[PDB]
Design a protein around this ligand. Sequence first.
Ligand SMILES: Cc1cc2nc3c(=O)[nH]c(=O)nc-3n(C[C@H](O)[C@H](O)[C@H](O)COP(=O)(O)O)c2cc1C
Ligand SMILES: Cc1cc2nc3c(=O)[nH]c(=O)nc-3n(C[C@H](O)[C@H](O)[C@H](O)COP(=O)(O)O)c2cc1C
Ligand SMILES: Nc1ncnc2c1ncn2[C@@H]1O[C@H](COP(=O)(O)OP(=O)(O)O)[C@@H](O)[C@H]1O
Ligand SMILES: Nc1ncnc2c1ncn2[C@@H]1O[C@H](COP(=O)(O)OP(=O)(O)O)[C@@H](O)[C@H]1O
Ligand code: SF4
Ligand code: SF4
Lengths: 729, 729
Amino acid sequence: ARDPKHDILFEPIQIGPKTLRNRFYQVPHAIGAGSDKPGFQSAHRSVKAEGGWAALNTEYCSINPESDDTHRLSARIWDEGDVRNLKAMTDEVHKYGALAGVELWYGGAHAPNMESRATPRGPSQYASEFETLSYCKEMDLSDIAQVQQFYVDAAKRSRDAGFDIVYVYGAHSYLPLQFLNPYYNKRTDKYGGSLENRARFWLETLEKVKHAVGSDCAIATRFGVDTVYGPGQIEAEVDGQKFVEMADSLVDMWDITIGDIAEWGEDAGPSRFYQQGHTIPWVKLVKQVSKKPVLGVGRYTDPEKMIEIVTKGYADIIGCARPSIADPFLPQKVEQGRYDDIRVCIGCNVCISRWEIGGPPMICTQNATAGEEYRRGWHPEKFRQTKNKDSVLIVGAGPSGSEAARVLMESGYTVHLTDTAEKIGGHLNQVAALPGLGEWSYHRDYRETQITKLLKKNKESQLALGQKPMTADDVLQYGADKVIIATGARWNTDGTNCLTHDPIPGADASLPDQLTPEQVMDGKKKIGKRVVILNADTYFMAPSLAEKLATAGHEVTIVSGVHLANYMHFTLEYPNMMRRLHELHVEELGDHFCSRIEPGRMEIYNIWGDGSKRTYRGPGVSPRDANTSHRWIEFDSLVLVTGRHSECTLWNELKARESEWAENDIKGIYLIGDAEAPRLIADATFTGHRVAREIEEANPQIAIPYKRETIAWGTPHMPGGNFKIEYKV
Amino acid sequence: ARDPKHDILFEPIQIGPKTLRNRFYQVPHAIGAGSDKPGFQSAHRSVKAEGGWAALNTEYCSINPESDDTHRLSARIWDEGDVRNLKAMTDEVHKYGALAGVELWYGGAHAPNMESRATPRGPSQYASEFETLSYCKEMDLSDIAQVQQFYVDAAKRSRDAGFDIVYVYGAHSYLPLQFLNPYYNKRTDKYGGSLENRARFWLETLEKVKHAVGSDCAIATRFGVDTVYGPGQIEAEVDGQKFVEMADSLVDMWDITIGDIAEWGEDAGPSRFYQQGHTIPWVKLVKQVSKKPVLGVGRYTDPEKMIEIVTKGYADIIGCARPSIADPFLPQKVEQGRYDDIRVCIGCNVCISRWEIGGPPMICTQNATAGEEYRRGWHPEKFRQTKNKDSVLIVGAGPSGSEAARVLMESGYTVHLTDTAEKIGGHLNQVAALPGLGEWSYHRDYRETQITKLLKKNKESQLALGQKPMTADDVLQYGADKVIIATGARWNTDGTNCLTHDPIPGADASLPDQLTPEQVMDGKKKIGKRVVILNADTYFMAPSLAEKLATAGHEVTIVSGVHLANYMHFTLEYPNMMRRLHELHVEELGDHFCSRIEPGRMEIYNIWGDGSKRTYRGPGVSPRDANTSHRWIEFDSLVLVTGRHSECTLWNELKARESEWAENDIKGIYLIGDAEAPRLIADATFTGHRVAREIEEANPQIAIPYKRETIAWGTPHMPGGNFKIEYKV
Ligand SMILES: Cc1cc2nc3c(=O)[nH]c(=O)nc-3n(C[C@H](O)[C@H](O)[C@H](O)COP(=O)(O)O)c2cc1C
Ligand SMILES: Cc1cc2nc3c(=O)[nH]c(=O)nc-3n(C[C@H](O)[C@H](O)[C@H](O)COP(=O)(O)O)c2cc1C
Ligand SMILES: Nc1ncnc2c1ncn2[C@@H]1O[C@H](COP(=O)(O)OP(=O)(O)O)[C@@H](O)[C@H]1O
Ligand SMILES: Nc1ncnc2c1ncn2[C@@H]1O[C@H](COP(=O)(O)OP(=O)(O)O)[C@@H](O)[C@H]1O
Ligand code: SF4
Ligand code: SF4
């Protein structure tokens, strides 16, 4: 049963002409669907409606072709075709009693317009600090009236599509905020200078939107109350609160954020730098002056933290984005008191990384069904029950193995999960011990809690940890109907890397002066004062080890053959990571790799050291002048972060002895996770989820087709339009 | 009439069971359409069919979901939905008497599979040097059988879709090439080691494909004959020629390329580094040992060069990619002797940049209709004729103005083009003088030639160059019905940049020790020994000026606040550009910007120097510890490359005096190109082309809507499929 203190989270709240059934609200957030993947958009938002979320919003929605985010994917409300596609979502959300909202967006020069090729307009002409090759035209008075009209027209179409909430989006340094912020606005007319002038564009837009649909829709506004850059941009207790007082009568609800667009990781705080409720100091400042309902995200996943901000008067509604992705049923679980069933977001920002890359669908480290609801028909809380009594043996309890176990158990199968390690988690148990990555353990905490609970529902199922390594013979004679090999991967020990695909002469982690990430994390092998980290991986390992070692007093130099922490650009961790490494005095040697290693020293070269001119010089000779940039650098300890390899020996033996499977009544053996190929934790988790869901298919090793959301030639996107080629002659 | 020497280019040639009408062949190349935008795919390929190209191929076509290039866009032939969408293209191409081909693709770990989430397979397990986080599973004998089956099934689907040519794609280091290349293949079984073993996967696949559709389709193979890395990978005279001898009897035509995937700019040679026919030394080696028709791209635009390679026996067919994008009608023009009407490709690779970015449609610097054929109905050789006699005045003869003039003239309007410059071309005249950019002048050569020719067709039209600057009074009294302001943009003189959007204290290009790009190119102002280039632009200007100054003996240091030459990663110029800067001893100071400038010295700081921890400290105080990395560096001359701004003074005056337009019989004035907002040359050209095409619309300043190719909710991509949400429970 639910704890009485949590009752407040279930009181309804009035926002203009609408009523939220409870205080759980999904703020606008990208998922890689927009108006292009209507099924994905509707399924993803509707399961949350079913899960109890009071209101579900689309991601930023473009009001006009001149605010086109291509290559990134945004929603669009340009014409009737968009109204049709988006309605699929509002209809499905209404089905479960929730409200639907749309975030009206105009990006100024931040929108690159790679599809439309149109010219974006802004308060002053500037080149975006985010999209550095994108410039806008300074708006004259008629430009202003025209863009304001775009908002009105968009709001109208939104009502036609069935939206209950319409936002005038002024966060992440988009249009309304550009007029308000002196960083962008250099105008000297009535739209620049003083706060009243700078606030004018926003105030007029709100008034016009409210006039157009205010009687049928709640008018909300998203506001970046502080750009977190100090004086020079927006400060909460200067322009921030004053703007709120000015616009308060026009808005039905305030949705607050902090930060800009270049560093919106300040808003979507990664667990690496920010804890739950990190935004509170800024958000509370708004309630202090507003008379309207206020909400402000802060990666809220804990009901105790939720009631605290509400009772303390910091906010009236609990806005979430990531917590809703990780667990679409969070509100229901809280309502029913099923706290231990909550799948807590680990703040990894991998969901965000997909949006940032531009084009691919969202994925989630915790929830393997995110993005799969529509195309694969995977509901996060409903599983097809087996009609047979097959038992399954799973070797390996890491992200992939533990998820496969969990899903199979939920499906009614008898499961035997084994590992040599003492706890569920696999490599994730080491990774969560890296500086700042503590919350990533929730991934294994959740599976541990769930597997334990599920064991009680089937006494034939078993959890065997701290065991001796399973061997081919052990597996063949275990007596299980099907076997899942989820043995993982290990970091390369011989220098093997993506640049050469070959070992590096002299690399050997068994030597006393060389180490792998595993040896560093175990903390047994001695590490000298001067450390060089040789890197060929673009994610978190090298930067994280650098931080760990530097804080421990070592002198660290990273020699990187690939762009250091490239993937961190997408997870929004990059800016603060570079700052952290800088304050720790970590030296970076980019554009360099290693040709050979000796005890205490290694030979490095610039990767752009070969001659620029290509000349055919016949066989045996390189077509460019030789790279002569080689130089030696010394080290006390060399840490190798060159790549990973699948630990698939067990699998290889089983495959070699496949003729014996039948004799032992083994119907099939499958390879998943890192053992199949080193993946991101999210995908490792996904492979486990997939073989479990498809264990009864013809070949569970390979995925069955998913529904594709691509246009069918012959069908025009514009209702009643002509799909045929028509030249204007 | 056509020069007789060029008759050979129009002789037919037999390829297996098919016959090519002439020697003009469009090899496979991406356009950002794939199987997702059937209209774009069919229109772009068919206009070339109408233009006389003998065969048109799709871009790389995925044979199965486990070879998914998302975020990049490829064609796909996975199911019936794809067959339907791709048939639109083959039908349309056949309608004009040309053949249609498809390039069957499986990419190994090079395909990141961000949409499918499937696991790629390869000869050995490796992390792609291109997609550094993407690993594949080592294939066992059943894996090999299954992948070869994918090819067979895709080939059968291709025939159903109406393709005449089917490729087994083995270039750009994709699957077949991975088995052949020791760099990837570390196998020790019958598929690795010796050449016969390394060639086995390709030979077997060719054989099975030929067996499945060889009687109905010509079987072609695209092969990267030399990886241009020297010993270690594929070398033309070693494994190259021998594999050709081995596979010769199986193929109907050889399509040859050089280079890998990480550096395919070696194939798609940028004019900055390679001239027309740059691949000859390698391509000719294949003809030397083959008994089948051979073709090898080399940015062929000149018919004289085309006959040279054919008569000298270097190739039998003229394969083109970029040349066909710049001019879909190149074949017809050569056939009719209209040599001066050929729109020559400048080898800028901006078309390619769009594919590389991932998701956006292709655009062309020379051909503003590329990508616009279907959605806007713009035919590159057909223009709607005007029914009135309006005269249009165009101020500025750069890429935008000259293109607007060309299109209006082709449409029958009376045009008056004027500029203060002595020649057509605007800023492009200075740009084409930078080291290696000489071929970019073809953009202005083409327009100079066409305008000159079009003047003869209407004696009222006029070209006035070398004139005094047009003033507002001059424009008002000129007597034109409509005016187009195309006055361009200039580089900032006060340090204004995308990072701060403000001037830099002490920046002033009128000072003796500071210069702008224009001042450097004019060659008048003196430049001292030690040069510092302050950059905040991500394209070619800073690197090009650095090269120019270094070769002239100056000591150059580039202080860059953004990723130096970032956009060049996309144009494939980056690798050779960095090697060039390295040879020239150009020092790079990335992740640094400038706070203030003094005579002979400037203060720089690390952009990541602020504290990593964010703490709310109230208004007036920055939430992070202060950046204290500031230090001073000296210079003899400082070159400012911080950004551009529109030169729109004339426009501003005309708009201020808008009440005077009517009395002067001016129906409208429009702002285009860089003067509206600094753009890439391709987009500047596009704005001119667009106002010209839409001069009669209600508001020519803003583009009319284009046909959108997005799915319509309610229509399944799979014929007969179910579009509704269906959960598997
Ligand atoms: C995948 C993703 C994409 C985002 N896209 C948007 C967007 O379209 N519009 C917007 O206003 N905010 C966007 N956000 C920001 C979120 O609305 C939110 O402010 C941020 O994730 C912090 O909320 P949380 O801590 O509850 O996740 C995005 C966040 C996520 C997780
Ligand atoms: C826009 C573009 C995309 C390309 N995509 C492909 C592709 O899908 N498949 C392929 O085999 N080659 C691709 N290429 C390579 C071209 O086929 C060709 O080898 C290269 O551009 C050199 O030919 P050219 O010099 O005539 O342009 C691409 C080139 C271009 C221009
Ligand atoms: N032969 C074996 N018997 C039992 N457990 C094994 C065996 N080989 C490996 N393991 C375990 O398999 C697990 C693999 O987990 P992990 O590396 O996290 O992979 P993934 O990310 O694919 O889940 C590890 O906990 C490892 O101890
Ligand atoms: N007042 C003016 N009268 C005539 N020509 C002008 C005037 N101001 C600028 N121009 C010319 O306009 C042209 C702008 O060209 P450019 O910078 O190449 O722009 P775009 O790239 O937009 O075509 C330059 O050739 C410049 O000399
Ligand atoms: S991908 Fe990570 S940050 Fe995003 S919702 Fe999932 S667990 Fe949270
Ligand atoms: S964009 Fe450039 S390289 Fe490409 S076809 Fe056009 S002119 Fe040629």
